[model samples]
Target: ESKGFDYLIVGAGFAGSVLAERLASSGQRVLIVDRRPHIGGNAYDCYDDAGVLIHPYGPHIFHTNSKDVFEYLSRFTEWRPYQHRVLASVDGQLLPIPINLDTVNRLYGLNLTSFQVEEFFASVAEKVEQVRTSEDVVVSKVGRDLYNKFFRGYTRKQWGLDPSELDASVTARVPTRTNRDNRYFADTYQAMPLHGYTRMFQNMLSSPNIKVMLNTDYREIADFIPFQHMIYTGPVDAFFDFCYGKLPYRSLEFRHETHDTEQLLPTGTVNYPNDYAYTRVSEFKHITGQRHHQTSVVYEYPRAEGDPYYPVPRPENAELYKKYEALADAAQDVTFVGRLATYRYYNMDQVVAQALATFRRLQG
Candidate 1:
């Protein structure tokens, strides 16, 4: 049978939609399929019963250092400047996370200046032989007490493992500050889609050269549909049918609700370091700039089993994913991109960048 499309893009998420938009605009017929009923993947947002915008999966804050990536998405939606600030609930106070100078001074009741805060950390910092695990990352810089107050319990609950049990790479990315910058991300561009993510997605897939299928898996209709090439954004292990064994992942079960109030949180997100069954709660009004009589919130409960979310970044899982990566590269006329396909837990902007990276390679 003759192929109807030049590309079969699986998963109507960032990666797939991006490739579809790029390919179709460049004059290729593209068909994108997502098993989910809607597009935008985890970045998808919608209105709750109280008529407030909410992220059904979890709060996705868009931040990136790349001007090109931000400039590209600018075509779809207008920008709403958003800078994320997260507080950790510890010792009966909600203090700035990243454990800045403010966090240290406020926690220990010391009025330390920025320079004094630097001195404070060095005095409290431990002399580790070498940094190996997530535990070592913070303790070596800020010592055990602050690590315990903020990172230890939170990391244990979020990843379902001790800080000592996880890789140092996990926590090495979290910055410790001597200054009073309380912004969660220090990226050059931090903003949200002014009309929400779904609206932006609609604009991206507006081209006539692109077709989308929702509530359907690619494998079930792979034979029925004809396409010249495939862009897969699903879990790589699942795409290869777990040939080497299942890749380890940390899944989240989100409990979302709308409260009859004007606001629900200090900022967009807050970490319950030593309290609650969940790790954090995000209030929509804080992130989306949506104002209503009622506010919507989402609490994340980490679990060992469920749909694959975070690919556990350790040696064993890396070895397992390597086997699948080999298979993906070996297969012809197929390209893999995004977090799930690459088995690395990436921020949303990274996925958008990854999709574009792949598109450039296939352009010729």
Candidate 2:
């Protein structure tokens, strides 16, 4: 049988789509398949009943320190400059996340300069000679009291593990700054696709040599499809058929609602660190910059089941993933990338950069 494509890419997210665009542009025929009905993967955004654009799965904000990644994605869509801010609901007051000077002042009702906040943290922070675990990361820098109030409950719910049990990198994502800068991410480039993520995906797969198949599972059609190489972005354990038992993953159950009010949240996201079953509530208008009479929001409730969202970051889990990684590394025709396939917590920009790097290797 004549092979119709040079590449069979699974999962139409950043990892798969970026590679598809690169391969197709280089005159290599690429066929991309996604199990979901839509493209863009979790970053997929669309209009709700209220005629407001919302991230149905959850909010995905684009922020990256890599200029190469930003420029690569720039070809697909015009961006709307957006700096994301997050507030933690604590003790009946909303305070900045990242435990900044302003967050300290607002939480304790004390006017402290950046230098004073630094001294205050030094006074309270436990002097851990060697910092380890998610708990250690926070407590060593801010002490147990603030860690208890902000990170403990949130990390427990988000990852379904005690902060001590998880890897330090899990909580390391949350930054604690003595400075007053309260933006959630301090990246060189922070923006969203001006039109929508779906549109940007459309532009990415616009090449004539690239064909996309939605509502399709790659495993079911792998034997039938004639492709020389494969780029897999699905769960690595699932791809290998779970021979080493299921890789633990924390899933999410999102409750989306449309409200009569114009705005429901002070910022794009508000963390319920000490209260509520759900971790946080996100208003999409703040993210998408959409104008509408009604507003839409999503509440994330982490669960042990459903679609795998986060790979549990534990040392044991890493050891288990290594078994699958060995299989992936040995497969000459397959390239594994993205959060699930690699079994790491990667941001959107990291995935893009990974995909581009993978493409460069393929070119070599």
Candidate 3:
């Protein structure tokens, strides 16, 4: 029997949308299905009642050094050219994040020059210390005070794991910069979609051969639409019925509120080290730059479960994922792409790039 589409993509996020566009453009029928009502996956955005474009899932900034990736996304949405700046809340004050030069001066009440700052850090920063874990990173670079202030508590709350036990790559994600570079990402191509990531996904799925099925879980279509190939972008363990136990992931609960007052938060993301129940509060206007009289804030509370936001990068988890990956590899009909599928944490561009590469492989 002829299929509804040659390929059925199981997620409308970057992994699915990018792959669907590539496949459909190459004269193959494609159907993009998202379990969520809207597209763009966890990075989806929509305008609120006050005309502020709010990130429905979370803030997803498009930042990549890949020229091809930028040019590809350019076909869908215009660039907003916004550099993502993050601030950390520590000791009852909001400071520029990544432990920057300005953060150092403000934290210590020092009028140190660049030379003096480096020398000062060198004096206190651990010497002859080989870095291993998250604890090692800050201690070697900025020393104990800064680590405890900015990292230790945040990691404990975010991942529900101690810094020493977790991988350094997991907690030391954002580097502690002594320079004045306040941008969250150091990518050459750094910006948000002009119309937002959701609209960009819509534009991508606007192809004649590409049909979208929203509010449609992949499980519902598991028996229907006998496509030659399947692309599953959901959780690796869930797709395989959790045969090798469950792959652990860090989840986030977003608390959105509108304030009549002039501005609610200091920066786009304010990391709370000691004071708050939540990890950070994101000012939507700063991330979206929405033109509105009223301001909005999203309080991010890291949870152990809900919607899997981050795949825990540790040895035991990796070994467990390898078991699921083996099952996927044996299943010749499906291609597992994206962070959840691979049991890896990837930025948006990286997922898109992976999807595009997978598409190319299937085509060839």
Clashing pairs in 1: none
Off by over 4 Å in 3: 1-3, 127-130
Candidate 2 lDDT over 309-330, as tens digits, reads 8988888999999999999999
Tens-digit per-residue lDDT, 35-62, candidate 1: 9899998789999888999998889999
> By the TM-score metric, which is better: model 2 or model 3?
2
TM-score order of candidates, best first?
2, 1, 3
| Candidate that scores best on lDDT | 2
Model 1 clashing-pair count:
0
- Return the TM-score for each candidate structure: 0.97, 0.98, 0.95
RMSD in angstroms, all models? Answer: 1.4, 1.1, 1.7
**In model 3, which range of ten residues has the least summed lDDT?**
127-136
Q: Predict model 3's lDDT versus the native.
A: 0.84
1 versus 2: better TM-score goes to? 2
TM-score (C-alpha) between model 3 and the true structure? 0.95
Winner of 1 and 3 under TM-score: 1
Candidate 3 per-residue lDDT over residues 28-114, each given as its tens digit: 888889998888888888887777788867676779999999999999998888888888877777888877888999988878777
lDDT, candidates in the order shown: 0.90, 0.93, 0.84
Clashes of 3: 0
Candidate ranking (lDDT, best to worst): 2, 1, 3
